Structures are given as structure tokens and as C-alpha cells.
């Protein structure tokens, strides 16, 4: 068994020139990488090369219009970069942004290809900027192209149209773009746990509520697990995996598992307010590894506490490498309510619930 790892310093070039302390920092990926070195996890992995996604690969999920406007920013003046960035919800743009978003998608394509052709069994991708908020026609929430959605489609392009792909999004924010891209799709199962607060939490839409189960052929194939009422942690996430995520994934029988692995639900995160521990992310990784013959790709998304996200993603890689999971309580009342609301809403589609 070989675990793959992809990381390219060039993805650090994406930067906010008006606010050097914006939390989507270049140092997010370099701090994670260094800790993988310090923990001797990088030497245990097979290094997968990064590459630029092609426009034809970007068109798998994104419209020509959206690609060409993000593309045009590569040659923009700072005034135009500021104006363009302000046109979106929570976006900053620099001249290198487009390039880095291409590298983040291509790095994951290469990783999914390594998994699917048997070169590695599983893989971890330390990439930025994130993508789960990116729609087919819009950039949003620090995301430009939806790296996880593109990798699902890329994976099917190099295998077959009907490849079954499970995207688990344990980023603290709802992946609105991933849900929308696959909302009418029964070949890609989307499962998102996320702080909701009746829509008061970013991305601030009721599309994230438990009653959004998909559309058309895709009904049943979108599972939203929204949290209400303050800090959640390991017990809430483990119970959601026990009653929901893992029963549904087993009935779905994914052939490939992609993890939209934001770490902004970890303690110390200012954009999450949760307390999921590094040991908890290790158990979520371990449980997902029981699916799809272990074919798991962990794609970095959010996560803004440099220490918490380096510790957390290190724990996940260690689980992929096969290390014994570490030792790891009553749920808050609203978490019980959230879980049973998802349970009742998806009972029609998943008989094992
Ligand atoms: O939280 C965000 C964006 C964070 C997205 C997580 C990307 Se994974 N933006 C905001 C907008 C208005 C007021 C307060 C915050
Ligand atoms: K999520
Ligand atoms: K779906
Ligand atoms: Zn997030």
C-alpha cells in the first residue's frame, strides 16, 4: 500500500495584496507541508507531481464565461483586480490567482489518476486556493474553481461515465458549488457536514439545510448535515458518521472517495468556532478508508489556524499510511436534532437508515 502526496510551492503565489493578514494565507499549505516533513510523513509517501489543469478539464464543471474572466485577471492592473474581486462574495484576486487555481485542480487530477490506475492506493493533496464554494459560473468564498467537483468529473472521464464517486465535505462551511454541480446527478454522492445557524453562517443560504436531498435523478444523492447552536466537536461528528455518513456511503458503494477536507471546524479556527480535534479527523479518515477498496483522496479546502490545520491534516495522512488510529460523550441537544432531521429526510432513499 502506497500513500501519495502532492504539494507545489507555486500555489503560494496566490495572495491578497490589500490585506497581508487575510486568513486564506499562502502559509496555510507551507505550514502543513513542513509539519508533514517534521513528522517524517512526507518520506513515507510517494510524491505525486503537480500540473496545471487545462481549460477543457475546467469546462467539465465550469462555463466558458466563468473560466475566461478568472483567466483574464492574470494580466489585470491592481485597480481592476480589486474591482473584480469585490464583484464576488468573499474573493480576493492577484495576477497569479488563476495559475494557482489551475495547479490546485491539476494536482488533484494527477492524484485521482494515481489512485485509479493503481500507482497509489490513497492520496493527500495540500492545495490552495480552495474550491467547494465555486459554482459552475461563479467564484465565491476564497474559491475559484471547484477542485473536488472537477476531480470527480475528471475521474469519470478517465474511467467511465458511471463511476460512483462519494464527495464527503467536512469543511465547516457548506459546499454550495459542489451540491449545485451534482444536484441532479445520481453518479456522484455529496455529503456535507457544516455549521448552518438557520442560514446565518456563510455561505448564508438555506440550500444547506437537511431538506435539500437533490433534484430529479439525483434525489437522495445529496445529504446535508447542518449544525445549529454553537460549538460542535468530535462527538457530534463521530455520531453523524455513525448514523448517517457511513450507512449511506456503504449503501451507495462508492468506487472512489474524495474528501473536501477543510479544517476550519478544528479548535482555534476563527471562521468555524468548533472544536474538532486532530484525533477526530484521524477517525473520520479511518472510517472513510473502509470504503471503495481504500480509494480515498483528501483535498485541502478551508482551515485558517495554521497550527490546527497542520496538526489535523498530518493526522489524516498518518491514517492513510495505515497507522493505528489514536484514542478519541453526550451530543449537544441540537446535534441530536440535526442528525434525526437528516435521518427522517433521507429514510425514503436509504433503506439501511
Ligand atoms: O466568512 C466568510 C468567508 C469564509 C469562507 C470559508 C471558505 Se472554505 N465571509 C464573510 C462575509 C461577510 C461577513 C463575514 C464573513
Ligand atoms: K461541509
Ligand atoms: K448528487
Ligand atoms: Zn470553510
Automatic annotation (TrEMBL):
GO terms for biological process: angiogenesis; chromatin organization; definitive hemopoiesis; hematopoietic progenitor cell differentiation; mitochondrion localization; negative regulation of cellular component organization; positive regulation of cellular component organization; regulation of microtubule-based process. It is found in: Cell projection, Axon; Cell projection, Dendrite; Cytoplasm, Cytoskeleton, Cilium basal body; Cytoplasm, Cytoskeleton, Microtubule organizing center, Centrosome. The chain holds residues 290 to 645 of 929 of the full protein. It comes from the Eukaryota. Belongs to the histone deacetylase family. HD type 2 subfamily. The lineage of its organism: Eukaryota, Metazoa, Chordata, Craniata, Vertebrata. Keywords: Actin-binding, Cell projection, Chromatin regulator, Cytoplasm, Cytoskeleton, Hydrolase, Metal-binding, Methylation, Nucleus, Phosphoprotein, Repeat, Repressor, Transcription, Transcription regulation, Transferase, Ubl conjugation, Ubl conjugation pathway, Zinc, Zinc-finger. GO terms for cellular component: axon; centrosome; dendrite; nucleus; perikaryon. Zn(2+) binds at residues 171, 173, 264. One of its GO terms (molecular function) is transferase activity. This is Protein deacetylase HDAC6.
Amino acid at each position: 500500500p502506497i500513500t501519495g502526496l502532492v504539494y507545489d510551492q507555486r500555489m503560494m503565489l496566490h495572495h491578497n495584496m490589500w490585506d497581508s493578514h487575510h486568513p486564506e494565507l499562502p502559509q496555510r499549505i507551507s505550514r502543513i507541508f513542513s509539519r508533514h516533513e517534521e513528522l517524517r510523513l512526507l518520506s513515507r509517501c510517494h510524491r505525486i507531481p503537480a500540473r496545471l489543469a487545462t481549460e477543457e478539464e475546467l469546462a467539465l464543471c465550469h462555463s466558458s464565461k466563468h473560466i475566461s474572466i478568472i483567466k483574464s485577471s492574470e494580466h489585470m492592473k491592481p485597480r481592476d483586480l480589486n474591482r473584480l474581486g469585490d464583484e464576488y462574495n468573499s474573493i480576493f484576486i492577484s495576477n497569479e490567482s488563476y495559475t494557482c487555481a489551475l495547479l490546485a485542480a491539476g494536482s488533484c487530477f494527477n492524484s485521482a489518476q494515481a489512485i485509479l490506475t493503481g500507482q497509489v492506493r490513497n492520496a493527500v493533496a495540500i492545495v490552495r486556493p480552495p474550491g467547494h464554494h465555486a459554482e459552475k459560473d461563479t467564484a465565491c468564498g476564497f474559491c475559484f474553481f471547484n477542485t473536488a467537483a472537477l476531480t470527480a468529473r475528471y475521474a469519470q472521464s478517465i474511467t467511465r461515465e458511471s463511476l460512483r464517486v462519494l464527495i464527503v465535505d467536512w469543511d465547516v462551511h457548506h459546499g454550495n458549488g459542489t451540491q449545485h454541480i451534482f444536484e441532479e446527478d445520481d453518479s456522484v454522492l455529496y455529503i456535507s457536514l457544516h455549521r448552518y445557524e438557520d442560514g446565518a453562517f456563510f455561505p448564508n443560504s438555506e440550500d444547506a439545510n437537511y431538506d435539500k436531498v437533490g433534484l430529479g435523478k439525483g434525489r437522495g444523492y445529496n445529504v446535508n448535515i447542518p449544525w445549529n447552536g454553537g460549538k460542535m466537536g468530535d462527538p457530534e461528528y463521530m455520531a453523524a458518521f455513525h448514523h448517517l455518513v457511513m450507512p449511506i456511503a456503504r449503501e451507495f458503494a462508492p468506487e472512489l472517495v474524495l474528501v473536501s477536507a477543510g479544517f476550519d471546524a478544528a479548535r482555534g479556527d476563527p471562521l468555524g468556532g468548533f472544536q474538532v480535534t486532530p484525533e477526530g479527523y484521524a477517525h473520520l479518515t479511518h472510517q472513510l478508508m473502509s470504503l471503495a477498496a481504500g480509494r480515498v483522496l483528501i483535498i485541502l479546502e478551508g482551515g485558517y489556524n495554521l497550527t490546527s490545520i497542520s496538526e489535523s491534516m498530518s493526522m489524516c495522512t498518518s491514517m492513510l499510511l495505515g497507522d493505528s488510529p489514536p484514542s478519541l460523550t453526550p451530543l449537544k441537544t441540537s446535534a441530536t436534532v440535526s442528525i434525526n432531521n437528516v435521518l427522517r429526510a433521507h429514510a425514503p432513499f436509504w433503506s439501511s437508515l
